Every structure is written in C-alpha cells, then in structure tokens.
Amino acid sequence: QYSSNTQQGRTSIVHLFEWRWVDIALECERYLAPKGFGGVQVSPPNENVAIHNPFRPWWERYQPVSYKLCTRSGNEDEFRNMVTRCNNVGVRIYVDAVINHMCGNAVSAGTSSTCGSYFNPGSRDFPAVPYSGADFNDGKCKTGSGDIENYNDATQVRDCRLSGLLDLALGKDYVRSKIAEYMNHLIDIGVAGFRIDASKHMAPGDIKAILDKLHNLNSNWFPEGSKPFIYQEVIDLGGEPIKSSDYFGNGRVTEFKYGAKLGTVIRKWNGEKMSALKNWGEGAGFMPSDRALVFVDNHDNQRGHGAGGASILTFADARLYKMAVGFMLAHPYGFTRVMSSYRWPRYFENGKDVNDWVGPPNDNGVTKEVTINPDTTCGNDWVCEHRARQIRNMVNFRNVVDGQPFTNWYDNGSNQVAFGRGNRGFIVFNNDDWTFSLTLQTGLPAGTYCDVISGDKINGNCTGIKIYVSDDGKAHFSISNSAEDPFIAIHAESKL
C-alpha cells in the first residue's frame, strides 16, 4: 500500500479538483505526461446527492447515494476512457474514496442524485447499493444528537455521524463487501490507488478489513503483485486520542502539520523564519517521511474548511504560495501532492467566507470544460496551478533529484536560505527585507544552468536567468527582496 505505482522517475500527484473526466484525459496526454507528473487525484467518482440549496456546492460530492460511476465529472464510459488514456501515457489515477458514510441524514428522500437513483435518508434506504437501516450505526452511537460532538472521545468519532452524514456499519462483513465491490470495480478499470476520505472516522482495523478484499492492480499496466497505493486523510495536529500513526498499517497518511507550519514560516508569522527549515521533516515534529503525504493546501483548507488555519497558503497569495510549493518540491521529505483549483467569489463576513460552498465553474450546474489559453494558462475560471512555470518546473526538479540527499545547506540566520540535492539540484530563497547577493557552494558540476523558476531551457539557450557554476561548484546568486519570484532553482537537466 506504500508504493505510489507511478512510472519510474515520476514523484508527484496533482489534485484536479472537480475536473471532468474528459478534460483529465486530454490533460494527461497533452501536458501531464510530457511534464513528468506521476498521477492525478480525482474527485469522488461515485453517485452523490444533487444539492440545490445552496446551488451545487463542491461538498455535495462527499454525500454518496450509490456506487454507480455517474457524477458531474462524467459517466462510467467517460471515467473508463480517462483511466485508460492516462495509463497509456504513464500517468496514474488515484480515487477519492468516500466510504465512511452515505449522505446527510436530513436530506430529502427522492431522486435528486447525479444518476437519478432513488434514496431515502430518513428511512436509511439506499436501494441502488443496496443498504438499509441494518447497515448504519444508529444503535451504536451514544451521543444525544447522533452526531459527533467531542473529538476527545474516540468512540464517538468512529461510531457517530460526521456533521450528520449517515455513518456506515464498517464492522459488518456485508458493508465491507459492498465497499470492496466498488473499489474493485475501480481497480479493474485501472486506478492506481486511493485517497481514503474521513479516515479518522473509521477504525484502522475496519479499513484493513476492506483493503484485505481488494484485487491486485490491473495486470495490463502494472507488474504482478502490485497493490493499490493508499493514503488516508487524518487531520492530526496533536491533542486528540486518535493519532496519524494509528493508520500506518494501511498506507501513507496526510500530514496536515506540514502546510500549517510551512505557511506560518513563509508568512514570517509567530517569530518563524526560513532558517529554521534546516530541520524540516521529522525534526519539525512531523511523522516519518516514508508515511507522509504532504501538500501546501488541500481542497478543504484553501477555503477554510477542515482544520482550516489562517496560515495556509493558496493561489490567493500567489507569490508566497509559489515559494512554499517550490520549497516542498525541492525538499526530500514526504510524497508530494500539488493542488489545482478553481476560482469562486470569496466574500467574508464575521471573519469567514460565506461563499466557501461554491462549486466548480458551471453553466446552470453543468461543469465548465477546461479551456487552454495561448500562453498555456486556463480559462473558464480554472486556476491550473499545476501549469504555472514555477510549479511545473519544480515538479520536474523533484523528479531529476529523486533519491539525492539534502545537503549544502546555507542560511543567514534569518530568511535567506539555500540547499542542494546531492549533485543534481540546488535551490536558493530570499524571504528577507533586503537583497540576497552571495556566492554559494551548489554541489553541481561546472557549467551554465537555466534558472527554472524564471524560465526554461530550449534549443540550447535559456529564456530566463542563467546561473554560472565554476569548477569548484560555487555560483553567484542575486535575488532582490522585491523580486516577483524571490527564489532560483537549477538542476542537472537545466544545464546547457
């Protein structure tokens, strides 16, 4: 469960949040494959409640009605077409598996669902699965509301309803089997693994019992014996009885400490500074590198959901965000996931975004296609962070330096820092209020290198800054504190 199953030499996943299947398939062929992305996290592909108040929120996709593969992203044919096309160019698909719960207990009965399946939350009837009242935890939960009220009590966190979402009886072989049937459908189509949603709300042993029922990966694309990559969503910032480590038997675990701390450091909040990043990883209090799934922001916290946090960096803070993503992709800790977002009309009241529910760009609820502008950015209100030169080129940096040790660390005791990855890459950051102008040991072979933050190597020249490494490995760097992107990165494949 720990191996990503990516093609060799690909080290990151991108979350194409709410993208349609056909647009992901095109994106695999035209962009993700040639730019060396390892794979795509897709939104939940199973049928969900169509929620019309408010109007088609992104969160309706976390309210299952059945395991039919029919959503705003596309139908089963489109999903299959995408997985095949992406695998055929060596880009994997990872599914957001919503398996702790069905929909909200107060949702009205009927056929307001993305495939028109009937369901009746009040009677616990989901005939398209099928599930009935026997398959939920009504009798097991002991809280007055039936909902989760107190995270200090592990029992209710597992047995009661997360925000009123109907909680599946995961101790029952019947329920485990229906969930495994869904996941094996996806495996056989060609999916490479899963993000297990709401993992804190399931016992580690119930997750194990489901995973035990799963097939090996599709043997046309994956070697014999391959198991799905598993990464579990557990928000563990400390202080609770449930710990991220409780889930290590099953796969990797999201490290939510990572982006919270990195945001604080890059914002220079709470007396934090980049010089402290020399101890990044376990030295910062995080879980073991071989179990962490890391990221700067995710689809919940970029809009204040989940654990939220004022320090989280997102595309809305573009300059600091690119620097944070660059640092994450250059540093060896963890397995990296890059967010790819859409725009929505943020509007704050009482310190909170009252439009944090808004779903993807749409025409009367039908998701808009992703259009590509001449300059390779996206239209139709898709942000496409993964197409920004500074991020795209850092995804390649991570591939180029894969396996090389963290070395040649420099800091000025404040916010000017630099480090290398063996003899294959070097990166330099200026987050202080004055110019960073210094000759540094890079660990690289002598030559002229293109800075991949400002530009690209193409037909024997650079389109941005050039860095000149001498025979002794030293090179001069000059980065103004008012630079639009105040960091520089060079690597073995950007050498002229």
Ligand SMILES: C[C@H]1O[C@H](O[C@H]2[C@H](O)[C@@H](O)[C@@H](O)O[C@@H]2CO)[C@H](O)[C@@H](O)[C@@H]1N[C@H]1C=C(CO)[C@@H](O[C@H]2O[C@H](CO)[C@@H](O)[C@H](O)[C@H]2O)[C@H](O)[C@H]1O
């Ligand atoms: C949104 C997250 O809520 C819970 O996180 C707790 C956390 O465990 C606790 O330590 C502390 O930090 O408070 C937070 C917030 O209460 C869950 O533990 C997380 O799993 C959860 N993230 C998840 C889960 C779901 C549910 O499938 C998704 O839901 C959202 O959709 C629901 C249902 O439609 C909406 O009602 C929510 O408002 C949405 O946030 C999340 O997107 C997914 O990532």
Ligand SMILES: [Ca+2]
């Ligand atoms: Ca549960």
Ligand SMILES: [Cl-]
């Ligand atoms: Cl996540």
